[PDB]
From a paper:
In this work, we determined a dimer structure of BbZIP in an inward-facing, inhibited conformation. To overcome the non-outer membrane issue, we reconstituted purified BbZIP into the small amphipol PMAL-C8 to form BbZIP-PMAL-C8 nanoparticles. The final refined dimer reconstruction contains 37,954 particles at a resolution of 3.05 Å as estimated by the gold standard Fourier Shell Correlation (FSC) at 0.143. The dimer structure consists of 18 transmembrane helices, nine from each protomer. Cd2+ has been shown to help stabilize the protein for crystallization, so we used Cd2+ in our protein purification and found six Cd2+ ions in the dimer. In each monomer, two Cd2+ ions are in the M1 and M2 binuclear sites in the middle of TM2, TM4, and TM5 as previously reported in the crystal structure. The third ion binds to a site (M3) near the cytoplasmic surface that consists of residues Asp144 on TM3, Glu276 on TM7, and two histidine residues, His149 and His151, on a loop (residues 146–166) between TM3 and TM4. The cryo-EM density for the M1-site Cd2+ is much higher than the M2-site Cd2+, indicating a partial occupancy in the M2 site. His149 and His151 are on the loop L(3,4) which is disordered in the crystal structure but is well ordered in the cryo-EM structure through the formation of the M3 site. Two modeled PE molecules interact with both monomers and might contribute to the stabilization of the dimer.
Numbering used by the authors:
A (entry chain A), B (entry chain B): 6 to 309
C-alpha cells in the first residue's frame, strides 16, 4: 500500500534527477565502507573511552534541545523578528563551528599523516564532497516539508504533516550528532569541548522554534514538546554513527572531519538560509548571524 | 534641488531607523580615527613598500574584473542556472577567504600582541562589529537597487536606474579592496597572496554578471563593459583605504583584520544570498558555494 506509492514516487524522482541519484549512491557506498572499517577496528582495538565521550556529548546536546523545548510552555507564540534573529544566530553558530573546528584541525591532522601541502586539502575536500552528496541525495529522496517554503521531496499524500515536519527536523539534526562524534574521535578534548558547546548553544533556540512550529501545525500544547525532545534524543544516534565512521585507519579521521563539516555547511544553506532570508527579513538574520559568528570565535579561542 | 530631496529622504529614513543611524555614527567615528592614525604614521615612519604591495594587488583585482567584463562580448545573455552557479561560487570564495585568511592570522597576531586567550577574540570581535555597523548603515543610507529584489534604500525618483546599479556594485566592491589593503599591511606575503588570488578569482565571474545585468538595464553593448571596468578601477581605492587604516599602532592591525572580514561576510548575506537563494534556486547556489569553499581551501593550504 504505502510502500508501493512511495516506491513509485522514488522511481519517478529518479527518472528526473539522475546526477543526484548517482551522487547519493557513491556517497552511501563511501559511508558504509567507512562504517564497516570502524566496526572492524572497534572489534579489534580498544577505543571505548572515545565512545563514552561521544555519548556524553550527545546527551548534552539532547539536554539542550529538551530545555529549549520546555522553554516553549511560557513564551506562547513569539513574534517573527525574534524567530528570524534566533535562527540567524543558530546558522552563524553552525557555520563558524563547522569552518574553524572541522577544517583547521582536519587540515593539521591530514598534514601530519600525509605531508603538508595540497594533499591535506585533497583528503578533506574528498570528505566535503562525500558529505554534500549524502545530504543532497537525502533531502531530495525524503518526503519532508519546511515551515514556509512548502512540501519538499517526493510526493506522498498519505501521511500527516506532523511526520513531514519531524522528518525535516531529523534531516537538520543528523549532521550535528555526526560532527560531535567525529570531534571526539582522537581524544584531544581541545576540539570536542568547543564543538559540543557550540552545538548545544545553537540547539537551544532551534528546539524552542521547533516546539512553536509543531504547535502551529496543530498539536495542542503538550505533544509539540514531546516531539522536540524526541529529536533531541535522536542526536546521540548521530554521535554514535560519527564515532563509528571516524575510527578505523588513521586517514579516516581527516576525511570525516570534512564530511560532517560539509554536511553541516550544506544543511545551513539548503535548509536554513531560506526561511530566514525571505521577503525583507535579511537585516535581523544577518545581525544574528554575525553575533553567532563572534560567539563561536570566543568559544574557539577560549575553551581550547 | 536634488540635494534637497535627498536630504529629506535621509531625514525621513533617520526618523524610522534610529539604531542603525547610531551604529553608522559610531562606526564612522572609529574608521575616521583609525585613518587619521594611519596618515600620521605614514607621515612619520616608512612603510612605503606595503603601499606598493597594496596598489599592485588592487591593480590585479581591477585587471580580473576588466577581463570578466570583456568576456561578455561573446556570451550573449547566458541562462539563469549558470548565473546562480557563478554567484554561488563567488559567495563561497568570499566567505571562505574572509573566514580563514582574515580570522586566523588576526587571532594569531592579536594573541602575540596582547596574550593568548579571550583578549584576541575581544579585539577582533570589536573589528567585526565596526565593519558590520559600517556596511549596514551604508546599505540603508544609500539609494541603490538590486537586480531582483527591487529598489533598496532611501527614495529618490530623480536619478536613472543605471546609477542605482552602479552604486550597488560600489557597495559590493569596497570591502574587497579594503581586505586586500589590510592583508598586505604587515608584509608577510603568506597572507596577501592567498587573499588577493581569491579576490581576483571571484571577481572574474562577478564582473561578467555585472556586464550582463547592465546590458539588461538598457546600455546597448558597449557601455556595460565600460562601467564594469570602472568598478574594477574603484577597487584600488578600497585597497588604499585599507592600507591606510591598517597602519598606525600595532593593535590596529588585528582590528582591521576583523573589520574588513566582517564587512565581507555581511555583504554576502545582505547582498548576495538573496538573488541566489530565491524561489527554488537553492541547489545550484549551494553546489557552487561548496566548490568555491574547496577551491579557497586549496589556495590557503598551498599558496602560503
Ligand atoms: C568552477 C565551477 C563553478 C560552478 C560549479 C558548480 C556548478 C554545478 C551545479 C550543477 C547542478 O546544480 O546540477 C545539480 C546536481 O549537480 C551535482 O550533483 C554535482 C555535485 C558536485 C558536488 C561537488 C561539491 C563539492 C566539490 C568539492 C571537490 C571534491 C573533490 C576534490 C578532490 C542538479 O542536477 P540534476 O540531477 O537535478 O539534473 C541535471 C540535468 N541537467
Ligand atoms: C544572543 C543574541 C541573539 C540575537 C542577536 C541579534 C538580534 C539583534 C537584531 C536587532 C535588529 O535587527 O535591529 C536592527 C538594527 O539592530 C542593530 O543595529 C544592532 C547592531 C548590532 C551589530 C552587532 C554585530 C556584531 C556583534 C559582535 C560583537 C562585537 C563586540 C564584541 C566585544 C534594526 O533596527 P532599526 O533601527 O531598523 O529599528 C528598530 C526599532 N525597533
Ligand atoms: Cd529540505
Ligand atoms: Cd539539534
Ligand atoms: Cd542547528
Ligand atoms: Cd543592498
Ligand atoms: Cd570586485
Ligand atoms: Cd565578490
Amino acid at each position: 500500500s504505502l510502500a508501493a506509492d512511495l516506491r513509485g514516487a522514488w522511481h519517478a524522482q529518479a527518472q528526473s534527477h539522475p546526477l543526484i541519484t548517482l551522487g547519493l549512491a557513491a556517497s552511501a557506498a563511501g559511508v558504509v565502507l567507512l562504517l564497516v572499517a570502524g566496526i572492524v577496528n572497534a572489534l579489534t582495538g580498544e577505543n571505548r573511552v572515545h565512545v563514552g565521550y561521544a555519548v556524553l556529548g550527545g546527551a548534552a546536546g539532547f539536554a539542550a534541545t529538551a530545555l529549549g523545548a520546555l522553554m516553549a510552555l511560557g513564551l506562547r507564540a513569539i513574534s517573527a523578528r525574534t524567530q528570524d534573529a534566533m535562527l540567524g544566530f543558530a546558522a552563524g553558530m553552525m557555520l563558524a563551528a563547522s569552518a574553524f573546528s572541522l577544517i583547521l584541525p582536519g587540515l593539521d591532522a591530514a598534514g601530519t599523516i600525509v605531508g603538508p601541502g595540497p594533499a591535506a586539502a585533497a583528503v578533506v575536500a574528498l570528505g566535503l564532497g562525500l558529505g554534500v552528496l549524502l545530504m543532497l541525495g537525502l533531502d531530495y529522496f525524503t518526503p519532508h516539508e519546511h515551515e514556509r517554503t512548502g512540501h519538499q521531496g517526493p510526493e506522498a499524500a498519505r501521511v500527516n504533516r506532523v511526520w513531514l515536519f519531524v522528518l525535516t527536523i531529523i534531516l537538520h539534526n543528523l549532521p550535528e550528532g555526526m560532527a560531535i562524534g567525529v570531534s571526539f574521535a582522537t581524544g584531544d578534548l581541545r576540539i570536542g569541548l568547543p564543538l559540543t558547546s557550540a552545538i548545544a548553544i545553537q540547539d537551544v533556540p532551534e528546539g524552542l522554534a521547533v516546539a512553536l512550529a509543531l504547535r502551529a501545525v496543530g498539536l495542542p500544547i503538550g505533544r509539540a514538546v514531546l516531539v522536540a525532545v524526541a529529536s533531541g534524543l535522536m542526536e546521540p544516534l548521530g554521535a554514535l554513527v560519527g564515532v563509528g565512521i571516524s575510527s578505523g585507519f588513521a586517514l579516516a579521521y581527516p576525511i570525516s572531519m570534512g564530511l560532517a563539516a560539509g554536511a553541516m555547511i550544506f544543511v545551513v544553506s539548503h535548509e536554513v538560509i531560506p526561511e530566514t532570508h525571505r521577503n525583507g527579513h535579511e537585516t535581523t538574520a544577518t545581525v544574528g548571524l554575525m553575533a553567532g559568528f563572534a560567539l563561536m570565535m570566543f568559544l574557539d579561542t577560549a575553551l581550547g
